[PDB]
């Protein structure tokens, strides 16, 4: 399905993924998120996220890609990156300040 959804990867060393409301306000600097927009999957790594969380997010993205027979494009970026795509923020309802924690 190409209806955008936001997945939240948390747990620090014990990474878990779960859908959360699709909004910028659902994000936080300590975790990882996958904004699944259908043809494009955006992976946002919180600046304080853990290696296990990054790996989990990547694993979920590959699984989604596999189910979709490789059609989606996957973009990965760190929270502090200077070239995060504008579409990521647009789909989240607009760029804004991220909570330090969930
Ligand atoms: Ca692909
Ligand atoms: Na975390």
Secondary structure topology:
Blueprint: E1 5-10, E2 16-20, E3 32-36, E4 40-45, H1 51-67, E5 73-78, H2 86-91
Parallel strand pairs: 4-5
Antiparallel strand pairs: 1-2, 1-3, 3-4
Sodium ion (NA) binds at residues 10, 12, 30-31, 49-50, 53.
Keywords: Actin capping, Actin-binding, Calcium, Repeat
Family: Belongs to the villin/gelsolin family.
Gelsolin-like repeats: 15-55
Description:
This protein has 102 residues and is an alpha+beta fold. The chain has a single domain, classed as Severin. The protein has two helices and five strands; from the N terminus they run E-E-E-E-H-E-H. It has a five-stranded mixed beta sheet, with helices on one face. The longest helix has 17 residues. It binds calcium ion and sodium ion. The site of calcium ion has 4 residues, from loops. The PDB classes it as actin-binding protein. The entry lists the keywords actin-binding protein, cytoskeleton, gelsolin, villin, PIP2.
